[PDB]
Amino acid sequence: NPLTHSTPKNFGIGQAVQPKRNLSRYVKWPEYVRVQRQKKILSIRLKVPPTIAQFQYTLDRNTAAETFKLFNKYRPETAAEKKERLTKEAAAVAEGKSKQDASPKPYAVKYGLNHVVALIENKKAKLVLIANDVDPIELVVFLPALCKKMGVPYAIVKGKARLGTLVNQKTSAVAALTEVRAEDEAALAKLVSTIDANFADKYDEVKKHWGGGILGNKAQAKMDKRA
Amino acid sequence: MRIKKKNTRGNARNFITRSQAVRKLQVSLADFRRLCIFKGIYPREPRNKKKANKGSTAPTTFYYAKDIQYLMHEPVLAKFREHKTFA
Amino acid sequence: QRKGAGSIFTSHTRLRQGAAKLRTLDYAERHGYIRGIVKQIVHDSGRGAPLAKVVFRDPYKYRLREEIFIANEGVHTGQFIYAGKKASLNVGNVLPLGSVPEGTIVSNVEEKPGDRGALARASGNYVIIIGHNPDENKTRVRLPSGAKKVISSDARGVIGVIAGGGRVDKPLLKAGRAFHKYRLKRNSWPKTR
Amino acid sequence: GAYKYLEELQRKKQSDVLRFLQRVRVWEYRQKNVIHRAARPTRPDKARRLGYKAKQGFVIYRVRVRR
Amino acid sequence: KSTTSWSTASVR
RNA sequence: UUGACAUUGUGAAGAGACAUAGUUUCUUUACUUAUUCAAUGAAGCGGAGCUGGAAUUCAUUUUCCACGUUCUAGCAUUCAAGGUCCCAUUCGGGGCUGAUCCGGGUU
RNA sequence: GAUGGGGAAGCUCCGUUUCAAAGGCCUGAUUUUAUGCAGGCCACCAUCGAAAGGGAAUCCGGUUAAGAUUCCGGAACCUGG
C-alpha cells in the first residue's frame, strides 16, 4: 500500500464544500401535495365532534380477514356469467321449461346506498359493513345511529376500495349480507357474535370524547420542557 | 449572414449517442437493444471522435442518426407498447 | 401631490452600484464565523460613503459569491472580514448585537434580525450600544437622532463608523454645484415655494 | 333512500357535526384558485333536485366571489 | 405525395 | 379617531347564576390550528436525547458554545481518499464507516 | 409587454421573476423472478426596443444617355464543413 495516502477532509464550518446529504425534509413540494398533507394535519390538530371520529374504530386485522373470508363467497355475478345464464334460460324458456324458474335462487351481497338504507327499515339486512373513508362523510355519518335504532348488526370497515373488490366496482361505501346459503349459517352466526363482542362492547366510550386535541412536535416538546 | 455555431453540422450531426438515441425513441434500454437487433442497426466509429463528442474522448457508441429516423416508425414498437398495456 | 404617480419623479439608477446589503444569515453566519477578502473600495453615484466589494466563498458549492458592504472608516483593500457569531472585535467585522459589550459602537445595524441593515447608514454616522437585557434577550441602543431604542440581540451590525465624515462643512457656493449634486438623485431641484 | 336523511341533516347548519366540517372545508377551498373544477358534487342530494345526473357530460365547477 | 403531418417513410 | 356585529377556535384561574350533585355570564393569564408580516435558487430547525468535556455537584443534574476554520491579497470542484467485509479476481464492482439518532412543522 | 396569478358588473386593469409540477444532459447484462425503467447530475427566465451605441470579412484600375467599394480585369480576405 505504498502509493495510496490518506487525505481526510474537514467538512468543518469554514473550510470544505459540504457533501451531498438527504435534504428531503426541506423539499418545496407541489401545491396539491402540500394541501393534502396540511388537511391531514389540520384534522389531527382540532377537536372533532363525537359523531365524527366515531369512525377510526374499525374491525381489527384478524376479524376483518375473517369477515372477508366469508363475504368473498358471495360475489355478485359478472358479465360473462350473466350472458351464460341468459343463454341457458334462452334455451329452456321454450324447449323444456322456464319462467325464470329453471335456474335456482341467487345469493349475493347488496351494495347500493339507497338500497341498503331501504333494506334496513324492512328489516332484512343481517350484517351491514360501512366504509370508514367517504370523502363527503355526511353520506354515512348517520348510518350507525339508524342501525342501532332498528337493531341491525353494523360494523365499520377500513377501506372502501376493499369493499368494492367484493362487488366489482372501484368503491362501494356500504355492503350488506341479507340472506346466506345453508352451509354458512354457523359461519354468519359466529361472525355476528364476534362483531358483537369486539365492536359493540369495546367501544362504549366512543359516544363521548371529542377527539383530536393533539399538539404538534415542537409545541409538545415546548410544553413538556416547561412543565 | 449569421455566423454559424461551431458545433452543429458534420460529424456532430451525422452520429448520435446511445443515450440520446434511447431518449429520442422513448422506449427503454432493453427494448432499444432488441429492436436494434431485429433491424438490425449497428454502431459506427466516427472519423473525428473529438469533433463528434463536442470536445472529448470518452468511450461511447454512435449510431447514424438517419438509421434511427428510419427506425422510429417500425410497426414493432407499437406492438411492444401494446404488450406493456396488456401487462 | 404630483410626485405620486411617478412619471418623472423616480430615481436615476444607471450608474448605481447595487443594493448595499450584508450577507444572508445562513448556518455558518449564525453558528460560527466566515471569512472574506475586501477587493476594491469604490464610489457609488448618489451616496456619500464609499462602497466595498467583499468576496466570500460558497459553503455549499464550488463557487465565489461577492457582496457589497458600506465601508467603515479604516478598512483597506486586502483585509480579511469576519462574519458570524464567533467573530472577533475589530473594525470591519459584523457581529450579533448580543455579543458586543456595552459602550461599543456599530454601524449599519439591523432592525429585525435578518433584514440586512437599517440604522446608521449615511456617511459619518454610528450607533452606540448602551446596555443589554439577557433574560428575555433584548438590547438598548442610541440612534443618531438621539432616540434610545431597544431591539433584538440577534440583529447584526458591522463595527466602526461610516466613512466619508465631514461632507457638510464645505459650502456649495454655486447653483451649479447643487445642480451637479442633485442631477444623480432625483428630480427635486430647483424648488418652488 | 338515504337522501331524506341527507337533506334533513343539511338543514341543521349550526350543529357541531356540521359547523366543524364548514371550517375544515372553507380552509381547504381557500388554497385552490378562485375558479376550479370539482371532481364530484359535494351536495349530491341538492344537485339532483336542481337537475344534476351522474352521466357523462354533467360538469361541476366551484367559484369564490368577494363579499 | 404527403397528405398528413406524419408519414411512415417507406424507404430505407 | 372611536362603539358595535361577523371572520373567532383550545385551556387555567378567579367570582356570579343551576336552588353541597356541572351547565351558562364579567375578569386576568396561557395556547396555536384560523388569519397577518418577511426571507430563503424552502440547507443543517425542535428541546431533547446520546457519546466528548469542562463546570458545581448537596444527591443528581441542571443553564453556556457544539469545541476541526484569526500573523500573510496562495489553493480548496469529478458518488472523497483511507479503514474494514464480500465477490468471482480482470480491465474492477458492491456494503458499513469516514459524516450519531429521532420528528404527521422550510425558517 | 405575454404566461403563473390577482382584481373589475364589464370594455379590461395590475405585474416581469413574480407565491407555478415553468427542462435538458449522463450512465446502465442496475441482476436475478426472465416481453412492463433503473440509478443520477445542473439550475433561470418568453419576447420587443438603436440604418448616430456594440459588431467577422475588399482594394485599385476601366466602364454608361442615366448604375457601381455591386458590373468587367486583376489582387485579396472572413465564416462554416
From Swiss-Prot, chain A:
The signal peptide annotation in the UniProt record is none
GO BP terms: namely:
cytoplasmic translation; maturation of LSU-rRNA
Q: Which UniProt keywords apply?
A: Cytoplasm, Ribonucleoprotein, Ribosomal protein
Task: Kindly indicate whether the keyword Disulfide bond belongs to this entry.
Answer: no
Q: Name one GO cellular component term.
A: cytosolic large ribosomal subunit
User: Which miscellaneous remark does the UniProt record hold?
Assistant: Present with 238000 molecules/cell in log phase SD medium.
Protein name per Swiss-Prot or TrEMBL: Large ribosomal subunit protein eL8A
Curated annotation (Swiss-Prot), chain B:
Compartments where located: Nucleus, Nucleolus; Nucleus, Nucleoplasm
**Can you say what this protein is called?**
Pescadillo homolog
What does the record say about induction? Expression is down-regulated prior to the diauxic shift.
Please state what is observed when this gene is inactivated: Essential gene. Reduced assembly of 60S ribosomes and accumulation of halfmer polyribosomes.
The signal sequence is none
Its quaternary organisation is:
Component of the NOP7 complex, composed of ERB1, NOP7 and YTM1. The complex is held together by ERB1, which interacts with NOP7 via its N-terminal domain and with YTM1 via a high-affinity interaction between the seven-bladed beta-propeller domains of the 2 proteins. The NOP7 complex associates with the 66S pre-ribosome. Also interacts with NOG1. May also associate with the origin recognition complex (ORC complex).
Kindly give any further remark recorded in the entry. Present with 4530 molecules/cell in log phase SD medium.
This molecule's function is given as:
Component of the NOP7 complex, which is required for maturation of the 25S and 5.8S ribosomal RNAs and formation of the 60S ribosome.
Q: Which gene encodes it?
A: NOP7
Intact protein stretch covered?
A: 1 to 87 of 605
The UniProt family comment states: Belongs to the pescadillo family.
Lineage top rank: taxon? Eukaryota
UniProtKB/Swiss-Prot annotation, chain C:
Q: Indicate the quaternary assembly.
A: Component of the large ribosomal subunit (LSU). Mature yeast ribosomes consist of a small (40S) and a large (60S) subunit. The 40S small subunit contains 1 molecule of ribosomal RNA (18S rRNA) and 33 different proteins (encoded by 57 genes). The large 60S subunit contains 3 rRNA molecules (25S, 5.8S and 5S rRNA) and 46 different proteins (encoded by 81 genes).
Subcellular localization(s) per the UniProt record: Cytoplasm
Keyword Ubl conjugation belongs to the record: yes
Work out whether the entry's keyword set contains RNA-binding: yes
The chain residues annotated with the modification Phosphoserine are 45, 88, 152-153
Role: Component of the ribosome, a large ribonucleoprotein complex responsible for the synthesis of proteins in the cell. The small ribosomal subunit (SSU) binds messenger RNAs (mRNAs) and translates the encoded message by selecting cognate aminoacyl-transfer RNA (tRNA) molecules. The large subunit (LSU) contains the ribosomal catalytic site termed the peptidyl transferase center (PTC), which catalyzes the formation of peptide bonds, thereby polymerizing the amino acids delivered by tRNAs into a polypeptide chain.
- Keywords, ordered alphabetically: Cytoplasm, Isopeptide bond, Phosphoprotein, Ribonucleoprotein, Ribosomal protein, RNA-binding, rRNA-binding, Ubl conjugation
Give the protein's recorded name.
Large ribosomal subunit protein uL2A
GO molecular function terms listed in the Swiss-Prot or TrEMBL record = RNA binding; rRNA binding; structural constituent of ribosome
Curated annotation (Swiss-Prot), chain E:
Record's superkingdom?
Answer: Eukaryota
The name of this protein is Ribosome biogenesis protein NOP53
What does the sequence similarity comment in the record state about its family? Belongs to the NOP53 family.
Q: What gene is behind this protein?
A: NOP53
Tell me which species this is from: Saccharomyces cerevisiae (strain ATCC 204508 / S288c) (Baker's yeast)
Location relative to the cell: Nucleus, Nucleolus; Nucleus, Nucleoplasm
Function summary: Late-acting factor in the nuclear maturation of 60S ribosomal subunits, which is required for normal acquisition of export competence. Required for the export of the large subunit. Acts to stimulate the RNase activity of the exosome complex, and may recruit the exosome to 7S pre-rRNA for processing. Associates with numerous RNAs including the 27S and 7S pre-rRNAs and the box H/ACA snoRNA snR37. Also interacts (via N-terminal region) with the mature 25S rRNA and the mature 5.8S rRNA.
- Deletion consequences: Inhibition of cell growth. Defects in processing of the rRNA components of the 60S ribosomal subunit and accumulation of the corresponding polyadenylated pre-rRNAs. Some delay in the maturation of the 35S primary transcript and 32S pre-rRNA. Delay in 20S pre-rRNA formation and a severe delay in mature 25S and 5.8S rRNA formation, with accumulation of the 35S, 32S, 27S, 26S and 7S pre-rRNAs and a 5' extended form of the 25S rRNA. Complete loss of synthesis of the mature 25S rRNA. Appearance at a low level of aberrant 23S species. Shorter 18S and 5.8S rRNA at the 5' end.
Cleaved signal peptide residues: none
